[PDB]
mmCIF file of C-alpha atoms in Angstrom:
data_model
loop_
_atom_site.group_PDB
_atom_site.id
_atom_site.type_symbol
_atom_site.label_atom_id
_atom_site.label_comp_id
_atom_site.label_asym_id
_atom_site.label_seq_id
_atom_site.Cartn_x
_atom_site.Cartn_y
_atom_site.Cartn_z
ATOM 1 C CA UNK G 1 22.858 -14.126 -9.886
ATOM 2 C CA UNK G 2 20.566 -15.781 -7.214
ATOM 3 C CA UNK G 3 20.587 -19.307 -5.651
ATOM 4 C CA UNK G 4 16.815 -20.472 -6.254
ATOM 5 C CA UNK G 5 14.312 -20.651 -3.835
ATOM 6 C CA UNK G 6 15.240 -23.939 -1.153
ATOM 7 C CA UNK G 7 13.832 -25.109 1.947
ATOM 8 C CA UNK G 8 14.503 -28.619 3.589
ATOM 9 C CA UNK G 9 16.919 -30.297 6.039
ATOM 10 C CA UNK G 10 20.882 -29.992 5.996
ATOM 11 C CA UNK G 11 22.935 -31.176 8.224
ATOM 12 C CA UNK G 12 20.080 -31.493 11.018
ATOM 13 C CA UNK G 13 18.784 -28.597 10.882
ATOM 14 C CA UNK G 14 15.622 -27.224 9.131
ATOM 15 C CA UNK G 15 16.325 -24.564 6.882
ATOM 16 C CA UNK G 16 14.317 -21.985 4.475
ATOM 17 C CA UNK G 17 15.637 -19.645 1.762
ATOM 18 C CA UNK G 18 13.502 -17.454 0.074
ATOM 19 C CA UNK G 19 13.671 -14.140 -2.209
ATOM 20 C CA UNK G 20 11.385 -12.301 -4.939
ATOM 21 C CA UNK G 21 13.796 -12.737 -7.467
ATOM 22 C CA UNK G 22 14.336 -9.111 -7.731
ATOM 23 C CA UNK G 23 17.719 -8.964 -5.431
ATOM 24 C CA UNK G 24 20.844 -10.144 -6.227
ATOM 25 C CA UNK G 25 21.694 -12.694 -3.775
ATOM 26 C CA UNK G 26 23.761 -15.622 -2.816
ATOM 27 C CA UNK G 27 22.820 -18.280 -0.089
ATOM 28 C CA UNK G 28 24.660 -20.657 1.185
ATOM 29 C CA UNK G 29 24.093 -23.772 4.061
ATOM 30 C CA UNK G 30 27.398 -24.055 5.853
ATOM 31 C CA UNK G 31 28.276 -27.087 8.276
ATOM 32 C CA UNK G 32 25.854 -27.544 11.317
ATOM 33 C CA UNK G 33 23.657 -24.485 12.076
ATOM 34 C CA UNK G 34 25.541 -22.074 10.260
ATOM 35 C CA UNK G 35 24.841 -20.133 6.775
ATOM 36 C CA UNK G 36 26.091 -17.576 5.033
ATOM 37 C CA UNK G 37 24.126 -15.023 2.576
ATOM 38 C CA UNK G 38 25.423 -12.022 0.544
ATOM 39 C CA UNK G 39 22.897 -9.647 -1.109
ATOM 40 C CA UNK G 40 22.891 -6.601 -2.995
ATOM 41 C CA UNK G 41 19.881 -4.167 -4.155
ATOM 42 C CA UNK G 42 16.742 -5.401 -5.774
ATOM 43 C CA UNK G 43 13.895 -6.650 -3.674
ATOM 44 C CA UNK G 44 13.317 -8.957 -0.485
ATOM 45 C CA UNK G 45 14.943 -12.227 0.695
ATOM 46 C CA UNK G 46 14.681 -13.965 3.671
ATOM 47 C CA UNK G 47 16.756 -17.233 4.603
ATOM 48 C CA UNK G 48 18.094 -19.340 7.772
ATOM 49 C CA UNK G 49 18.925 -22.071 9.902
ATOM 50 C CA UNK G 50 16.723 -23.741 13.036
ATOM 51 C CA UNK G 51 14.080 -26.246 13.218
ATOM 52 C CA UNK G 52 10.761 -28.293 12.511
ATOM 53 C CA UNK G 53 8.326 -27.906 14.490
ATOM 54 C CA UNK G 54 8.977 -25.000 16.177
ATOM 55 C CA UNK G 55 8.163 -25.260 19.920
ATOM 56 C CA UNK G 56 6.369 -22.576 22.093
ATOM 57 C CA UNK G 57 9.168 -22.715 24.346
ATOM 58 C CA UNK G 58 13.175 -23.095 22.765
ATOM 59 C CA UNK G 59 16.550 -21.531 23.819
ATOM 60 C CA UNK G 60 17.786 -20.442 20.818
ATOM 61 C CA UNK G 61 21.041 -19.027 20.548
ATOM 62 C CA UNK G 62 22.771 -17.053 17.389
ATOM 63 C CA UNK G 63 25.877 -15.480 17.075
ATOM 64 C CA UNK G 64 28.378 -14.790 13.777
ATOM 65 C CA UNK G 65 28.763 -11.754 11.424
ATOM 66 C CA UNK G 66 26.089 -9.314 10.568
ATOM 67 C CA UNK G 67 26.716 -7.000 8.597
ATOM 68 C CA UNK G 68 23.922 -5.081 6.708
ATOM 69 C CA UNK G 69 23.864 -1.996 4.478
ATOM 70 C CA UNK G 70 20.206 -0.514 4.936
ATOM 71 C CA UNK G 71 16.796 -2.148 5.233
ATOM 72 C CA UNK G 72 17.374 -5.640 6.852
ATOM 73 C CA UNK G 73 16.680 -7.330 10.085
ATOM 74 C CA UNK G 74 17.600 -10.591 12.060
ATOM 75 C CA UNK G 75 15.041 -11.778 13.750
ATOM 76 C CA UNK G 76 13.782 -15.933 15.347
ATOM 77 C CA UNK G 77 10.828 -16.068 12.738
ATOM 78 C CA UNK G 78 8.753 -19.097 12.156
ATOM 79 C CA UNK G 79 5.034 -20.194 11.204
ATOM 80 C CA UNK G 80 1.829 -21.699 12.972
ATOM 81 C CA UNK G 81 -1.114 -22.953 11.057
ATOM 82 C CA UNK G 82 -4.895 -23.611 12.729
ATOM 83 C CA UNK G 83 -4.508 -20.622 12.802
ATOM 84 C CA UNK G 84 -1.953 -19.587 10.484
ATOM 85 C CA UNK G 85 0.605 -17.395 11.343
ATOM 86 C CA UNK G 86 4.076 -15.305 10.542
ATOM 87 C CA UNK G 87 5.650 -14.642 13.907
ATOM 88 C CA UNK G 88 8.761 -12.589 14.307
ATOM 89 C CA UNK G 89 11.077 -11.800 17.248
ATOM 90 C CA UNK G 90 13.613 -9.078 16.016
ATOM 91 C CA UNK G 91 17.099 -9.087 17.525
ATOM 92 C CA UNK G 92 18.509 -6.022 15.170
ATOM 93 C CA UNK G 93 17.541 -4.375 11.900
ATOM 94 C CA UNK G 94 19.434 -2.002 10.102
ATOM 95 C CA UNK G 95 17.175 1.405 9.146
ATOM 96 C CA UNK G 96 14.042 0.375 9.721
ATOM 97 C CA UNK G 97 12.365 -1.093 12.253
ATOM 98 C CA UNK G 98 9.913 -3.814 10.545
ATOM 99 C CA UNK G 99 7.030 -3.738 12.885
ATOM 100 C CA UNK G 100 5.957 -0.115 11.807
ATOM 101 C CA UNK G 101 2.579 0.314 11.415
ATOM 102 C CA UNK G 102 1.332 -2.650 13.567
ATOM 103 C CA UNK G 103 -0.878 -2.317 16.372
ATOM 104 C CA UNK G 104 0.418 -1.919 19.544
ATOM 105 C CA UNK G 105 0.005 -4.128 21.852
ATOM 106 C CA UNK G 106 2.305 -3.524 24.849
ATOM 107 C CA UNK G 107 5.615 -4.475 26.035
ATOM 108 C CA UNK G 108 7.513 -7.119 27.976
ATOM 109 C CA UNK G 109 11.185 -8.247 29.512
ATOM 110 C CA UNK G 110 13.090 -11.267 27.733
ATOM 111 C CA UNK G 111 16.567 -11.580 27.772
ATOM 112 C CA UNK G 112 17.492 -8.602 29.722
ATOM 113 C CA UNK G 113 16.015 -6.508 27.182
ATOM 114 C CA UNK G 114 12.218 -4.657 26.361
ATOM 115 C CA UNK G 115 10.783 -5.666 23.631
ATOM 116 C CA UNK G 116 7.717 -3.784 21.598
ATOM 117 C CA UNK G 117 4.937 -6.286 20.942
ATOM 118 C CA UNK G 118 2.519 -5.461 17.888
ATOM 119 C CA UNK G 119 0.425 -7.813 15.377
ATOM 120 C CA UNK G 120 -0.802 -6.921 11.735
ATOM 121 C CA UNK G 121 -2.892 -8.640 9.681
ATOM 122 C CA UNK G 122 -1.820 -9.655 5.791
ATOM 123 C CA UNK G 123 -5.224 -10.455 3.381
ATOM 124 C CA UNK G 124 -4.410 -12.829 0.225
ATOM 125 C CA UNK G 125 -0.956 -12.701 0.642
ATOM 126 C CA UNK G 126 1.972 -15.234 -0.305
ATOM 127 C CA UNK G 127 2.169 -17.735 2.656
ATOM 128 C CA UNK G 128 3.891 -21.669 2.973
ATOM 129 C CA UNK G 129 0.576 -22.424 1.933
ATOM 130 C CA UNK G 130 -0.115 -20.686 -0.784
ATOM 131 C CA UNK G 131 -2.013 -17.456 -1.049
ATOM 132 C CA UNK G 132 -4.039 -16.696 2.436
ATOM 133 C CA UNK G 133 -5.224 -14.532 5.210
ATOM 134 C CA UNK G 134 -3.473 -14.668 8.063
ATOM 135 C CA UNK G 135 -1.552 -12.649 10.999
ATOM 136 C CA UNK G 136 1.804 -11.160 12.006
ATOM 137 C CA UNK G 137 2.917 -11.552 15.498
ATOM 138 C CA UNK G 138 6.029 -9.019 16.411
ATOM 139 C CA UNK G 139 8.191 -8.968 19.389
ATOM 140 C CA UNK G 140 10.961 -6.465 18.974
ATOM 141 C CA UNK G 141 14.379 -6.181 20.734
ATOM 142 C CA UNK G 142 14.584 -2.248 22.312
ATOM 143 C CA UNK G 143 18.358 -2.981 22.655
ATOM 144 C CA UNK G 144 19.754 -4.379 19.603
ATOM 145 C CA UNK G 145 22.427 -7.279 19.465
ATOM 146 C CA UNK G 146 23.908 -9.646 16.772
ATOM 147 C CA UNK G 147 24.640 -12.913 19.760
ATOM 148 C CA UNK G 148 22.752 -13.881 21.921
ATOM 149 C CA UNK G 149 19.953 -16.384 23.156
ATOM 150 C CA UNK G 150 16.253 -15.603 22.592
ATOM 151 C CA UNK G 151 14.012 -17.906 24.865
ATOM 152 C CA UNK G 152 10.888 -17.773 22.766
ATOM 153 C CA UNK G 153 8.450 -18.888 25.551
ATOM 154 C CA UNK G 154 8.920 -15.623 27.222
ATOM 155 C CA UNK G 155 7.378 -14.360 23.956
ATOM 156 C CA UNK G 156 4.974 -16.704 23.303
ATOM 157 C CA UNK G 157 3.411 -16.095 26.747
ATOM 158 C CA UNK G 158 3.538 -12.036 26.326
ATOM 159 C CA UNK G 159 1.703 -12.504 23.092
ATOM 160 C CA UNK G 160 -0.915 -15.177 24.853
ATOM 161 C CA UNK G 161 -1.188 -12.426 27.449
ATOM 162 C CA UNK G 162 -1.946 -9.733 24.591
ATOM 163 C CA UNK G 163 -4.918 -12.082 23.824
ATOM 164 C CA UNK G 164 -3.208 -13.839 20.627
ATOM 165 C CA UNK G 165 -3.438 -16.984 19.499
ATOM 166 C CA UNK G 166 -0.314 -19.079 19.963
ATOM 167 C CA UNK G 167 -2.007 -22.453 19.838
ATOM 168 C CA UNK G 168 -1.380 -23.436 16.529
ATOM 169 C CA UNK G 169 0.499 -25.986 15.242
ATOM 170 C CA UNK G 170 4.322 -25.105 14.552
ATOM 171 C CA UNK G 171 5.796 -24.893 11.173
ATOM 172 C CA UNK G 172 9.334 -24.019 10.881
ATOM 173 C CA UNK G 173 11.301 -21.809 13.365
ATOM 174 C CA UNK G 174 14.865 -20.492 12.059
ATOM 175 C CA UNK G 175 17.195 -17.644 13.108
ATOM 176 C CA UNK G 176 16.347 -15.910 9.545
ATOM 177 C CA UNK G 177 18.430 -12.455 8.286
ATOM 178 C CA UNK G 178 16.113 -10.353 5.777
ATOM 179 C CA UNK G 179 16.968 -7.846 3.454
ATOM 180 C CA UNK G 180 15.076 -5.660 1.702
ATOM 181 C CA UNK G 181 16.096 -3.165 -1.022
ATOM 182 C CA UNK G 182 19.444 -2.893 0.426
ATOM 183 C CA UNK G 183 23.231 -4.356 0.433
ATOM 184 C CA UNK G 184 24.459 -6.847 2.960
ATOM 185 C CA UNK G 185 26.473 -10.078 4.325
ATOM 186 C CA UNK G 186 25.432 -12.235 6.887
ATOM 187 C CA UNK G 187 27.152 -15.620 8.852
ATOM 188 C CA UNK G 188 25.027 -16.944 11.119
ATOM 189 C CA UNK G 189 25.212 -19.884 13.448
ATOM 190 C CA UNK G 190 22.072 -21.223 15.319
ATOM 191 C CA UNK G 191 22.014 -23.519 17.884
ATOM 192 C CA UNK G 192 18.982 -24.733 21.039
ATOM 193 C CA UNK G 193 21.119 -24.254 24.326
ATOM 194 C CA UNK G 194 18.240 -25.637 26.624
#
């Protein structure tokens, strides 16, 4: 079956689970910052665990079991509005590496790793607020890992640097797993280590 679109608070921490409805797809909020999702074929999903607001600058760490079977990715991912925007920083994917096709816009060092910095723009697309116009920001991970902490100022500042806009006012910002058109489990615990 699927567990039905959720987002809200559990257990102190924000959380957001989302899928098409085409997947098959089971999501679960374990105790503190950890959940659990198992997915088979069908379409996309995207769920975790972290906070509201965001902040510019967090150390978040993640660590637990992924385990993906084609097209996924883990990744800190989180919104801004004024202006709105879907921001991603990509700690692993499976197959494909979800930034393809954006424009490049450089690299930088975070966490003793490079990371590939792009944006793309999506026009009247599905957003938290409804159907808009708005960007992608993408910062990802050259060498891939499933623990770790990601201090997101580091990319904040290399997309400010880049000329983006990272001004806005924070929405959410979880540790989310994606799949798309694929199999897959996932148990992930969050955590702010600053």
């Amino acid at each position: 079956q699927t567990t039905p679109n959720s987002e809200g608070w559990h257990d102190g921490y924000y959380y957001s689970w989302w899928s098409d409805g085409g997947a098959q797809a089971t999501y679960t909020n374990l105790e503190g910052g950890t959940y659990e999702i198992s997915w088979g074929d069908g379409g996309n999903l995207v769920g975790g665990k972290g906070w509201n607001p965001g902040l510019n600058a967090r150390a978040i760490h993640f660590e637990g079991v992924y385990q993906p079977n084609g097209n996924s990715y883990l990744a800190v991912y989180g919104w801004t509005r004024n202006p709105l925007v879907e921001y991603y920083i990509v700690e692993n994917f499976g197959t494909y590496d979800p930034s393809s096709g954006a424009t490049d816009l450089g690299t930088v060092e975070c966490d003793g790793s490079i990371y590939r910095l792009g944006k793309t723009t999506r026009v009247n697309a599905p957003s938290i607020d409804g159907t808009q116009t708005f960007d992608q920001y993408w910062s990802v991970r050259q060498d891939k890992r499933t623990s770790g902490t990601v201090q997101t100022g580091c990319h904040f500042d290399a997309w400010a640097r880049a000329g983006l806009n990272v001004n806005g006012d924070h929405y959410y910002q979880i540790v989310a797993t994606e799949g798309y058109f694929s199999s897959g489990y996932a148990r992930i615990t969050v955590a702010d280590v600053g």
